Amino acid sequence: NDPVTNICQAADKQLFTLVEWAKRIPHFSELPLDDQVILLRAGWNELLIASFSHRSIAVKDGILLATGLHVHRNSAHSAGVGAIFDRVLTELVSKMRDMQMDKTELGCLRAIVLFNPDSKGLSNPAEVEALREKVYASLEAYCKHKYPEQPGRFAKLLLRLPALRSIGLKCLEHLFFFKLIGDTPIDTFLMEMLEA
Amino acid sequence: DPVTNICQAADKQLFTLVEWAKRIPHFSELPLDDQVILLRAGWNELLIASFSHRSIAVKDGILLATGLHVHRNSAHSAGVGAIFDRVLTELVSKMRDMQMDKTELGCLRAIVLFNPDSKGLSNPAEVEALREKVYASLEAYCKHKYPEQPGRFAKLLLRLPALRSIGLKCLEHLFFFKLIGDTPIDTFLMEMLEAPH
Amino acid sequence: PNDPVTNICQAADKQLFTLVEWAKRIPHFSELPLDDQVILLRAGWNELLIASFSHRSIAVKDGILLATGLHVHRNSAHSAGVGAIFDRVLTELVSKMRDMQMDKTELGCLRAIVLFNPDSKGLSNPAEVEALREKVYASLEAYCKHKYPEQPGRFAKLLLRLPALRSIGLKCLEHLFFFKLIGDTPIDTFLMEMLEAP
Amino acid sequence: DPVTNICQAADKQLFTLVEWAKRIPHFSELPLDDQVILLRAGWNELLIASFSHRSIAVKDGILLATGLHVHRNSAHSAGVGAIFDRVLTELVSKMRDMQMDKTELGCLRAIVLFNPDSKGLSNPAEVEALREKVYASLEAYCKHKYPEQPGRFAKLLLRLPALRSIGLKCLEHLFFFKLIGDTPIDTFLMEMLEAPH
Numbered sequence: 142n143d144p145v146t147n148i149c150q151a152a153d154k155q156l157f158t159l160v161e162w163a164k165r166i167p168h169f170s171e172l173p174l175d176d177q178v179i180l181l182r183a184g185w186n187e188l189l190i191a192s193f194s195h196r197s198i199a200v201k202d203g204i205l206l207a208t209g210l211h212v213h214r215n216s217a218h219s220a221g222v223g224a225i226f227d228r229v230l231t232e233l234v235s236k237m238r239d240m241q242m243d244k245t246e247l248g249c250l251r252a253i254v255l256f257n258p259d260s261k262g263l264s265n266p267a268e269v270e271a272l273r274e275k276v277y278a279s280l281e282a283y284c285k286h287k288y289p290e291q292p293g294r295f296a297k298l299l300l301r302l303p304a305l306r307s308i309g310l311k312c313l314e315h316l317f318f319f320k321l322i323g324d325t326p327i328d329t330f331l332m333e334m335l336e337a
Numbered sequence: 338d339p340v341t342n343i344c345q346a347a348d349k350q351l352f353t354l355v356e357w358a359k360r361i362p363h364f365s366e367l368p369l370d371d372q373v374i375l376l377r378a379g380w381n382e383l384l385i386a387s388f389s390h391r392s393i394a395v396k397d398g399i400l401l402a403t404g405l406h407v408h409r410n411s412a413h414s415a416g417v418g419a420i421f422d423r424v425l426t427e428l429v430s431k432m433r434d435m436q437m438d439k440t441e442l443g444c445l446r447a448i449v450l451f452n453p454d455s456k457g458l459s460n461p462a463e464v465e466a467l468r469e470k471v472y473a474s475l476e477a478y479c480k481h482k483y484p485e486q487p488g489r490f491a492k493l494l495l496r497l498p499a500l501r502s503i504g505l506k507c508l509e510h511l512f513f514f515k516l517i518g519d520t521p522i523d524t525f526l527m528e529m530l531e532a533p534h
Numbered sequence: 535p536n537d538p539v540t541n542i543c544q545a546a547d548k549q550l551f552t553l554v555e556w557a558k559r560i561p562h563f564s565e566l567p568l569d570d571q572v573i574l575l576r577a578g579w580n581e582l583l584i585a586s587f588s589h590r591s592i593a594v595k596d597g598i599l600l601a602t603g604l605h606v607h608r609n610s611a612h613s614a615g616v617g618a619i620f621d622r623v624l625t626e627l628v629s630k631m632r633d634m635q636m637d638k639t640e641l642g643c644l645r646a647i648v649l650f651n652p653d654s655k656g657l658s659n660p661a662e663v664e665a666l667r668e669k670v671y672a673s674l675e676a677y678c679k680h681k682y683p684e685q686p687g688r689f690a691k692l693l694l695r696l697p698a699l700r701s702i703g704l705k706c707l708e709h710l711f712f713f714k715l716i717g718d719t720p721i722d723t724f725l726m727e728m729l730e731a732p
Numbered sequence: 733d734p735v736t737n738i739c740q741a742a743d744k745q746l747f748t749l750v751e752w753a754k755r756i757p758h759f760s761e762l763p764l765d766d767q768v769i770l771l772r773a774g775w776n777e778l779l780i781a782s783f784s785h786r787s788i789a790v791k792d793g794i795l796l797a798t799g800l801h802v803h804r805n806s807a808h809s810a811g812v813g814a815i816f817d818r819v820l821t822e823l824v825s826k827m828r829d830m831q832m833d834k835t836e837l838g839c840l841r842a843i844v845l846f847n848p849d850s851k852g853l854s855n856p857a858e859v860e861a862l863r864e865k866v867y868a869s870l871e872a873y874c875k876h877k878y879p880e881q882p883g884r885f886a887k888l889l890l891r892l893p894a895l896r897s898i899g900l901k902c903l904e905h906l907f908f909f910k911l912i913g914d915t916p917i918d919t920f921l922m923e924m925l926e927a928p929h
């Protein structure tokens with residue numbers, strides 16, 4: 142009934158999904174708790190974007206949110222975030238589709254993103270760089286075994302990260318996720334009050 | 338818990354705003370989708386205008402509606418100090434020095450509300466006509482309430498560009514998040530991390 | 535020729551000077567301390583420029599007429615990547631100036647109000663600048679009421695284009711609007727000639 | 733003139749950038765419209781990558797092409813202390829510590845240049861294919877230069893997200909203007925004021 146509160150609840154649930162995921166990554170929970178907070182704050186955007194972009198591989202012209210919401214271009218443009226939507230489709234989803242990025246590869250990429258040594262305030266960044274290195278070593282080993290005819294695949298996966306970074310910035314800037322899940326609930330709320 | 342309080346308080350502020358808009362003469366005569374466009378386009382400036390005027394009783398700080406006081410120290414610490422000082426020096430102090438009264442504030446807000454430039458309006462001309470009715474009322478008010486201050490009406494209108502730019506800066510730099518949403522997110526996260534897995 | 539940025543700078547240089555020459559003609563402006571004059575010009579230059587070319591562009595439909603003679607159309611503005619800001623200028627300023635037939639006296643007054651901006655950071659004496667601003671808008675009001683007595687709402691309507699000018703000014707500075715407009719083509723040209731060149 | 737200095741310096745950098753691109757294998761075989769697009773999409777990151785690597789021999793400062801040495805003092809003074817520190821911590825110091833050499837730098841810049849995401853590219857796939865050739869070559873080089881660092885190749889590619897956000901932040905904050913254009917403009921304006929009448 143109360144739109145902002147419902148939106149926050151949805152944000153709450155989403156963020157907790159991410160926290161549980163990170164705790165299942167080997168060695169994340171062994172890091173200091175402050176450093177864990179720092180990594181999740183620094184990374185939550187790209188992590189969520191990476192996640193919903195891969196999920197949207199099977200669908201036409203849209204984004205599947207973890208909330209179940211199926212966002213089309215029209216809706217995204219209605220919410221004032223059509224440009225960013227387009228970029229997600231073009232630079233992430235379609236490229237994920239085209240190379241058939243699998244779930245193991247996505248997880249490794251998200252774990253790389255999570256273990257971001259550049260995150261400000263890290264008591265021990267070198268330690269975080271070292272976890273990231275273990276992760277990418279494993280991803281490379283995986284790609285070579287699973288896709289031997291594709292020697293450049295590991296690098297191709299790594300090279301989606303600059304795109305993810307810039308889209309992540311734009312999403313943070315324009316409150317992408319919040320505008321999408323909130324736009325219609327706000328219109329609906331407003332309309333009900335305005336008619337009463 | 339901190340985050341929950343913020344969301345509820347936002348929901349309350351949104352409620353009060355819509356109720357205020359409905360009592361504005363002729364607002365409800367507009368097509369409902371236009372009323373919605375206007376409220377969504379105006380909420381930020383409308384809010385900044387209110388808390389600025391409410392803050393004239395305070396030195397170098399701001400009063401958000403729930404008796405929540407924020408000092409410029411906290412703004413500067415959070416990295417939004419320059420913006421906070423623009424609120425203080427371009428809105429608050431100016432409102433204080435001219436003794437902007439509550440009728441003049443209500444009019445400025447109604448003018449902000451009736452924004453004919455808002456994208457998607459089915460009829461911007463009707464919105465411009467409602468805006469002109471409001472500023473005609475305001476000019477009538479100022480002339481008769483303050484007949485010894487001939488430039489007062491204009492002075493009030495000339496606080497609107499400051500409101501516009503401060504409004505943009507606030508959103509651009511996540512002013513509100515950095516002031517009142519930052520720490521609660523840290524707390525929120527720590528709790529999640531400590532939760533049973 | 536062969537130095538695209540230099541040429542862009544010369545054009546901007548010439549444009550800013552037109553603004554500075556206009557300001558020195560505004561009564562009392564040159565009586566302010568020099569450092570205040572510089573503060574006012576830096577704070578106001580973008581809005582002053584936008585206001586000038588917007589008003590100049592009433593003479594055309596769907597374009598911006600620059601002081602040099604360059605007529606910028608929508609296609610150029612789109613190529614330049616600033617189509618959105620371009621459309622705001624046309625919609626919020628040009629067409630609204632046209633709708634009310636804002637005249638050159640009113641344009642001059644509105645720009646002088648913009649120049650005498652008492653919120654400009656660092657002014658030695660902000661009240662002195664507010665005092666000059668107040669003189670200007672009293673003159674503008676008496677002018678509108680004398681020239682257009684049948685439009686009692688005109689003065690206020692003029693002032694009420696200022697918030698739009700403010701937001702568009704911020705967007706223009708942010709995306710280097712003016713510089714992309716006068717600079718997009720010469721850059722492509724310089725690049726192209728170089729890439730074709732042996 | 734100081735401003736005239738800056739413009740001429742930028743024209744120089746542009747010229748050198750273009751001549752560099754032409755010497756990148758297969759670059760000139762792309763459509764000319766596509767070459768222009770890539771150079772325009774890439775110039776900012778390409779410049780930042782170069783002055784960052786150039787600054788490794790410099791203590792607590794940044795070196796711009798004309799021996800223009802910029803220290804933290806100036807950066808903090810200009811309100812861009814934060815971005816300055818990012819360039820040092822995320823680019824300059826990481827380049828230094830892993831001893832990124834000019835061949836690796838060259839490969840990374842070429843990867844940047846061959847950006848298949850650039851808007852308006854007539855054939856994105858063609859650009860992506862050139863990127864892959866460049867990165868295969870960079871991997872081959874890392875393998876023999878440091879066979880005992882199997883993670884060097886990936887480590888190099890993983891500075892590119894930092895370069896991307898740094899590039900965006902520099903533009904958003906007018907980083908270069910605030911550092912080298914700010915005072916010259918004051919001088920320029922004062923000269924304009926000294927002109928007759």
Ligand SMILES: CC1=C(CCc2nnn[nH]2)c2ccccc2/C1=C\c1ccc(C(C)C)cc1
Pocket residue numbers: 343346347350401402405507508509510511512513514515517518519
């Ligand atoms: C728009 C907004 C964001 C979204 C991000 C943002 N955009 N601009 N500033 N912050 C945010 C995030 C956290 C906390 C608040 C906020 C906020 C606005 C707000 C909420 C509550 C109050 C009162 C009732 C206390 C006042 C303003």
Ligand SMILES: CC1=C(CCc2nnn[nH]2)c2ccccc2/C1=C\c1ccc(C(C)C)cc1
Pocket residue numbers: 710738741742745796797798800902903904905906907908909910912913
């Ligand atoms: C992009 C840019 C602006 C436009 C505004 C801007 N955007 N991002 N930063 N500044 C500007 C303005 C004034 C002076 C420089 C600049 C500048 C970049 C620049 C120019 C010359 C050099 C030389 C040293 C090779 C280096 C960088």
